[PDB]
């Protein structure tokens, strides 16, 4: 169900995400596959609404943060990268696990892209005073959904399937 | 439902073919992934020909799982579908993760075989399938019924990775 029903939800109720749910989101992230099992992820968890609202300024497409009770900033540590070529993929897998787990827990979430847009990456580095080795990846805003639902939109397209050869 | 915890990289498979219905479900799962701009840039080559699958193992030094796999899915992205080309690898990674999770859900084993951005691997996949310039190899996923490995929970949680409010 969660693969079909997971949606980008950008509008939230007032109430906080339970600490037990926050932990489950982070556990889900850390179960992602990673190149070389390098597990390069670090996470900043925000519940301070003043700071979440400020964080909404990191990009032009991050307005969901203005009502979010929770934000999770996904970062990768260069020093942990055995296979630096594929760190974005590791982080994307972790992000997708968070999104799916959020839907499982009846939460709404949306992936707010950062890497590799320089102005976004720079904003996140500055906002969190990040060391040179700590690379911003994305922000996930999370809350209980307002009006929007985790409901199935059927995106299947058989034209994307090539049998044996392109 | 414990699929996020139990999904493992499975690199050795039984000879049993993956049922047509399960193949379709894997591809459906891929296509439900989020994507920047909703650009949905993905294309898939599905292989069940064992000679072609074995040949495909040569694309990388880390693709030996294909030598026993009854199914391979090559993930590709089309430049001409990209509205936000800066993020296409992320879209494709989300699709790959959906495949892997759906595989575990269906009692299958799978492993992500990285390609992009390793030039030799991408070049080998382009050549093997004679791809158009705009069709970019992303990865290969080998899939089958597990031989001597399991989808089981290896707990990778590390609380030191969690920073509260600030780094
Ligand atoms: C981007 C990426 C590329 C990967 N490439 C390979 C690969 O080429 N060959 C391989 O055997 N495993 C590959 N893996 C699988 C990882 O080695 C595996 O996820 C890691 O060892 C953790 O084990 P798990 O998947 O069981 O959690 C890749 C994983 C990721 C996310
Ligand atoms: C790499 C990536 C970056 C994204 N960046 C943003 C973003 O900055 N702001 C936003 O509102 N949504 C963002 N999204 C969410 C997409 O717009 C969304 O996945 C797409 O419209 C499909 O809708 P769905 O998630 O409901 O399936 C991003 C998604 C991906 C995978």
Is A61 annotated to bind ligand?
yes
Question: In what order do the strands lie in the sheet containing A161-163?
Answer: A161-163, B42-47, B71-78, B135-144, B109-114
The reply to whether residue B165 touches residue A31, judged by beta carbons under 8 angstroms, is no
Per DSSP bridges, beta strands B162-164 and A41-46 are parallel
**CB contact (8 A) between residue B31 and residue A160:** yes
SS (H, E, C) B57-82: HHHCCCCHHHHCCCEEEEEEEEHHHC
Q: Say which of A3, A45, A91 has its CB closest to residue B162.
A: A45
Report helix, strand or coil for A130.
coil
Resolution in angstroms comes to 1.4
Determination technique for this entry: X-ray
* Ligand 2 neighbourhood includes A61 CB (under 6 angstroms): yes
How close B129 gets to chain A, by Cα (Å)? 6
Asked whether the beta carbons of residue B46 and residue A89 sit closer than 8 angstroms, the reply is: no
d(CA A45, CA A91): 16
The domains of chain A, with CATH numbers, are: 1-166 (3.40.109.10)
Report the alpha-carbon distance of residue B33 to residue A4 in Å, rounded.
Answer: 9
- Taking residue A109's Cβ as centre, other Cβ atoms within 10 Å add up to 32
């Amino acid at each position: 169900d969660i693969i079909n029903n997971r949606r980008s939800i950008r509008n939230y109720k007032g109430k906080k995400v339970e600490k037990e749910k926050i932990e489950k989101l982070l556990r889900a992230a850390m179960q992602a596959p990673s190149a070389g099992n390098q597990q390069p992820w670090e996470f900043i968890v925000l519940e301070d609404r003043e700071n979440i609202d400020k964080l909404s300024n990191f990009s032009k497409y991050a307005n969901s943060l203005k009502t979010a009770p929770l934000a999770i900033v996904l970062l990768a540590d260069e020093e942990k990268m055995k296979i630096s070529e594929m760190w974005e993929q590791d982080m994307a897998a972790a992000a997708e696990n968070i999104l799916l787990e959020a839907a499982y827990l009846d939460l709404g979430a949306v992936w707010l892209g950062a890497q590799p847009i320089e102005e976004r990456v720079k904003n996140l580095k500055e906002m969190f005073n990040l060391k040179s080795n700590i690379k911003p990846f994305c922000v996930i805003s999370v809350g209980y959904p307002e009006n929007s639902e985790n409901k199935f939109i059927d995106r299947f397209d058989a034209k994307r399937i090539h049998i044996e050869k392109y």
